[PDB]
Design a protein around this ligand. Structure first.
Ligand SMILES: C=CCO[C@]1(C(=O)O)C[C@@H](O)[C@@H](O)[C@@H]([C@H](O)CO[C@]2(C(=O)O)C[C@@H](O)[C@@H](O)[C@@H]([C@H](O)CO)O2)O1
Ligand SMILES: [Mg+2]
Ligand SMILES: [Zn+2]
Lengths: 222, 219
């Protein structure tokens, strides 16, 4: 199995530096060029640069947009790719992806990592408040029941939300965060048969990596 | 500098129908030495990383459904999806690799489906929020189509517009519906001055708004 996993994303101040990593396995790393690509929230992909394979001396090239400011390197003993970013500005806020690139023949990016999100801002890290969403005085006898969690007042993005440790994925809607007064809020709904709640437990699992927050919130009737 | 441009910016197509989208390069991507066009297509589904579909203009990667076909040459390329499926909802990007790499700006594919009414649910503030002095009331409007929808909040029968924020999901990859959340945030002191809290959803599927409410005295 080919795996690409980026790390290192987070909050950094304008003017600052940040280095991302991309751990790889499942292919002969030195045989491949590797690229970095970024994507501002809701915008297009932008190719940033590559580092060539062993046959081509591991040389680097960059988009004019970042040449002189970003540097790519690689550890060929551990199969890790790096992106050093300097003099960061708000326009650099984006999801950063590593992608497997050319092997001397094929023209394609075969594989991409999950991406790591970089936020360039002066705002401080704020952990979320996580509140349960249980029905008030509703009928409940409506065949299905919808529960939720409100993840309020955090910074920066992202947060992750799962339900029952990912066992409940069907009938889950996690609503995109909205920014207000320097803080994000999102919510997540889950819909299950009434015969299973509250007789069985339903818990939302929330994480906010920037503050290392981990929350498990049981939805209790009341 | 090779400029990549895609058309259309967005479109919606019903399941079973054909989708056509275009990619233009400012210079020919036909490599003389290999006699191939260095043009690839990527699919990025909501919340996911891009995935390779097609490369060398017309080579379909293993595992990609045969309903996806790349065509074209030189400066003009086409991605055609026959018999589109709900799961094909995505932004599609082309990318040249003739000289370094450059992506097009993407084509957003939405899936058209039959109109569907929302399922509305309302939630009072939790005691754990109230303890800290805040009161958020939440309304979920789930599984509707089309995306346009109106939500009004009423407090003791009077509309309130301030302190309300809305967020729509991306289209669902299975049923092609949207959902939306609407959250009204008040202070505890103001929350405690009123009894009835109502969210009203008006959607083209009915001239009757869907009304969900709770009363503080019943909590
Ligand atoms: C000059 C011909 C050399 O061709 C090869 C080779 O035989 O070593 C094979 C090609 O596939 C290609 O790898 C080239 C050379 O390394 C250039 O490859 C790039 C590049 O800038 O590194 C990358 C490719 O993706 C492609 O953009 C080519 C471009 O087509 C020019 O050759 O450039 O070496
Ligand atoms: Mg849904
Ligand atoms: Zn060079």
């Amino acid at each position: 199995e080919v795996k690409l996993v980026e790390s290192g994303g987070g909050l950094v101040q304008s003017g600052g530096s940040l280095r991302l990593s991309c751990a790889t396995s499942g292919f002969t790393f030195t045989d491949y060029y590797m690229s970095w690509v970024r994507q501002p929230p809701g915008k297009a992909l932008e190719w940033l640069g590559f580092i060539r394979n062993k046959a081509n001396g591991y040389t680097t090239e960059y988009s004019p947009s970042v040449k002189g400011r970003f540097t790519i390197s690689r550890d060929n003993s551990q199969s890790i790719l790096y992106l050093q970013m300097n003099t960061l500005r708000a326009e650099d806020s984006a999801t950063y992806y590593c992608a497997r690139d050319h092997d001397g023949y094929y023209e394609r990016f075969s594989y991409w990592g999950q991406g790591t999100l970089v936020t360039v801002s002066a705002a401080k890290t704020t952990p979320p408040s996580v509140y349960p969403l249980a029905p008030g005085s509703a009928a409940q006898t409506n065949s299905m029941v919808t529960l939720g969690c409100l993840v309020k007042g955090y910074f920066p993005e992202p947060v992750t939300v799962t339900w029952n440790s990912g066992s409940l994925s069907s009938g889950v809607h996690t609503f995109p965060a909205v920014l207000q007064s320097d803080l994000y809020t999102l919510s997540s709904s889950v819909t299950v048969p009434s015969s299973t709640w509250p007789s069985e437990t339903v818990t939302c699992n929330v994480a906010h990596p920037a503050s290392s927050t981990k929350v498990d919130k049981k939805i209790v009737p009341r | 500098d090779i400029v990549m441009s895609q058309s259309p910016s967005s479109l919606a197509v019903s399941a079973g129908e054909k989708v056509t989208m275009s990619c233009k390069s400012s210079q020919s991507l036909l490599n003389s030495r290999t006699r191939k066009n260095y043009l690839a297509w990527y699919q990025q589904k909501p919340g996911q990383s891009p995935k390779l579909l097609i490369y060398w203009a017309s080579t379909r990667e293993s595992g990609v459904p045969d309903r996806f076909t790349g065509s074209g040459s030189g400066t003009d390329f086409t991605l055609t999806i026959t018999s589109v499926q709900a799961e094909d909802l995505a932004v599609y990007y082309c990318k040249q690799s003739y000289n370094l790499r450059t992506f097009g700006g993407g084509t957003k594919l939405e899936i058209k489906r039959a109109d569907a009414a929302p399922t509305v649910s309302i939630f009072p503030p939790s005691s754990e929020q109230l303890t800290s002095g805040g009161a958020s009331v939440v309304c979920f409007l789930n599984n509707f189509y089309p995306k346009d929808i109106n939500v009004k909040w009423k407090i003791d029968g009077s509309e309130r517009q301030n302190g309300v924020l809305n967020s729509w999901t991306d289209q669902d990859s299975k049923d092609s519906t949207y959902s939306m959340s609407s959250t009204l945030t008040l202070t505890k002191d103001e929350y405690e001055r009123h009894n009835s809290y109502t969210c009203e959803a008006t959607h083209k599927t009915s001239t009757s708004p869907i009304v969900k409410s709770f009363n503080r005295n019943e909590c």
